[PDB]
Design a protein around this nucleic acid. Structure first.
Ligand SMILES: Nc1ccn([C@@H]2O[C@H](COP(=O)(O)OP(=O)(O)OP(=O)(O)O)[C@@H](O)[C@H]2O)c(=O)n1
Ligand SMILES: OC[C@H]1O[C@@](CO)(O[C@H]2O[C@H](CO)[C@@H](O)[C@H](O)[C@H]2O)[C@@H](O)[C@@H]1O
Length: 578
DNA sequence: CCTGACTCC
DNA sequence: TGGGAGTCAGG
């Protein structure tokens, strides 16, 4: 494969259609080096050194010109890496990573070679082959690097049409071009903006937490009558089941279980298990949300810059890494206070948080076309209280807080394919009763039962299931004669259209929201998405408008057979936006 | 490196 | 024997 190793940018490299590689080898691309550039177009194939291309006003103009279309793989990586250099990338019309992800998330495509494999294209090497793995990872000699980048660009160039053609067959071309690609740009902005952190506050919490860990730790040793590593499920298992001779409720492949659910069930036998649960909760707060967070905060700006992986989950959700900002504590007050350290990036700005209320159950209502479930949402009746009246068979006045919590476990459990065994274990109730709850639920919501039957049948017949905006998940195990394997696939068939349609909806909402913010020239911008919620920051003056704009855009992103409902709060910190 | 903790939706 | 994720310490 012939290419030019160019010393300067020329006009023919700046055609209005090109495959473009802007190579960043560090896995975390924030403020990461760009090691090489390749361009393939109608005129030839070119390798450029970054020092050259990125200092060249004409190349930089071309990068930022939206009418000059680029085909890429992982354009968000390149866009953010370029942002850290103050260079804008526009005109990305095809992203091979996102295309491959839509065609089959299970393939785990994460380099051009793996995408190319999908079309039996082999004139390109895997990145790991060129760079090496782990401690061996290195950028090779220029001629080797240059050929690799050029070959990746040529693969993207040749693969665009084949991938677009299959997406069109799957009814997924608009999902790529109107949803995932625009979202990629929005996520790039979110990651690059980052979220500001009050490190003084975290360091203080950390100091206090260290004190408390020491106290809980020593009390646990007193209760155990021995010192041991409480963070070692192995050592803990000996203490609990050999020394204290507590009952063994569950084993894993390696030994005794010490899961939270097991320890809770052991509470009637020894008080030490409650202390241990507390200690493990505190230790995670310290290790992860204090120490781990502080490790990744950029010290001069005090911002953290997560990476949203847009091409990983099997259902169409995002994930968040380094750090994960989608699992910041909220359920326990001690941990929830971590959110006090997430603050606005400017003076006199505020945090604004908006979340869909029960979007999975509303989606289930839509997809199952269950009259009773649809009517509950159409009239905004409390769905957990409704299910309680049904499973316990009482009037609304007789529903206690605990009954509602159990009904809630039923409501979400059904969505995730729970068995009577799993429900009984989660609620710690008789399995006979758990089975009755499930039987009563399906008697009350017969449309949901038909849905579960139908979607498993569809998966068996077609080999995959689909979401509202035509995302797909293949389920080859659905016809397995093996009960365990088939059962897991049946649960995925039931759940994926629900979880995945919910992901589709919030993604479309982010695009519609961005458009409106820019339309109204507001300074407000997105910081985070947490599956069914959106977190923004804005100058305090803009709260009144956002209180109207954000929930309307979210509720109207798609139109279902039941309303969507969005709650919203704002405050001086993420904690206070409650 | 894998497992089993913890955290979120 | 409930769906989808990431990080951490221990081994
Ligand atoms: N028994 C439960 C309860 C909750 N969840 C999970 O935790 C998420 C958040 O649940 P939650 O906030 O409690 O849902 P709500 O319906 O909004 O609860 P509530 O009306 O009481 O505020 C759910 O989407 C689900 O993924 C679960 O798996 N099992
Ligand atoms: O840039 C995100 C993009 O890159 C991939 C590899 O193609 O994931 C890499 O980067 C992630 C973000 O740092 C890492 O978490 C991951 O380990 C690394 O392979 C894709 O998975 C992805 O969407």
């Amino acid at each position: 494969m012939a290419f030019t190793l160019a010393d300067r940018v020329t006009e023919e490299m700046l055609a209005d259609k090109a495959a473009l590689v802007v190579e960043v080898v560090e896995e975390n691309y924030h403020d990461a080096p760009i090691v090489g550039i390749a361009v393939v177009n109608e005129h030839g194939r070119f390798f450029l050194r970054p020092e050259t291309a990125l200092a060249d006003p004409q190349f930089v103009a071309w990068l930022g010109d939206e009418t000059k279309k680029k085909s890429m793989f992982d354009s968000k990586r390149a866009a953010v890496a370029l942002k850290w250099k103050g260079i804008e990338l526009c005109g990305v019309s095809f992203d091979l990573l996102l295309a491959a992800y839509l065609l089959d998330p299970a393939q785990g495509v994460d380099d051009v070679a793996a995408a190319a494999k999908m079309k039996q294209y082999e004139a390109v090497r895997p990145d790991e082959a060129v760079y090496g793995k782990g401690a061996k990872r290195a950028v090779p000699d220029e001629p080797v690097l240059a050929e690799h980048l050029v070959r990746k660009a040529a693969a993207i160039w040749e693969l665009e049409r084949p991938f677009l053609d299959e997406l069109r067959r799957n009814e997924q071309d608009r999902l790529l071009v109107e949803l995932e690609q625009p979202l990629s740009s929005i996520l790039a902005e979110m990651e690059f903006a980052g979220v500001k952190v009050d490190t003084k506050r975290l360091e203080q919490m950390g100091k206090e937490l260290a004190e408390q860990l020491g106290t809980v730790e020593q009390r646990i040793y007193e209760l155990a009558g021995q010192e041991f590593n409480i963070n070692s499920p192995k050592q803990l298992g000996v203490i609990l089941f050999e020394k204290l001779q507590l009952p063994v409720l569950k084993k894993t492949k390696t030994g005794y279980s010490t899961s939270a659910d097991v320890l809770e069930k052991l509470a009637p036998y020894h008080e030490i298990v409650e202390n241990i649960l507390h200690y493990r909760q505190l230790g995670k707060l310290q290790s992860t949300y204090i120490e781990g967070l502080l490790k990744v905060v950029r010290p001069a700006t005090k911002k953290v810059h997560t990476i949203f992986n847009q091409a990983l989950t099997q259902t169409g959700r995002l994930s968040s890494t380094e750090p994960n900002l989608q699992n910041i504590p909220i359920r326990l007050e001690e941990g929830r206070k971590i959110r006090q350290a997430f603050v606005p990036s400017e003076s006199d700005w505020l945090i604004f948080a908006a979340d869909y209320s029960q979007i999975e159950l509303r989606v289930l209502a839509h997809i199952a076309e269950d009259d009773n479930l649809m009517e509950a949402f159409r009239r905004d009746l409390d769905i957990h209280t409704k299910t309680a009246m049904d499973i316990f068979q009482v009037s609304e006045d007789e529903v206690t807080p605990n009954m509602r919590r159990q009904a809630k476990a039923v409501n979400y459990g059904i969505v995730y394919g729970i068995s009577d065994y799993g429900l009984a274990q989660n609620l710690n109730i008789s399995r006979k009763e758990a089975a009755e709850f499930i039987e009563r639920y399906f008697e009350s919501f017969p449309g949901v039962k038909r849905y579960m039957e139908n979607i498993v049948q569809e998966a068996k017949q077609k080999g995959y299931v689909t979401t509202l905006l035509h995302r797909r998940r293949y389920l080859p195990d659905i016809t397995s004669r093996n009960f365990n394997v088939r059962s897991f696939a049946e649960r995925m068939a039931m759940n994926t259209p629900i979880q995945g349609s919910a992901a589709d909806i919030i993604k479309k909402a982010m695009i519609d929201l961005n458009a409106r913010l820019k339309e109204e020239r507001l300074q407000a911008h997105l910081l985070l998405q947490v599956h069914d919620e959106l977190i923004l920051e804005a100058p305090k003056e803009e709260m009144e408008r956002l209180c109207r704009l954000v929930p309307e855009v979210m509720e109207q992103a798609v139109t279902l057979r039941v309303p969507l409902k969005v709650d919203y709060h704002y405050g001086s910190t993420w904690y206070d936006a409650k």
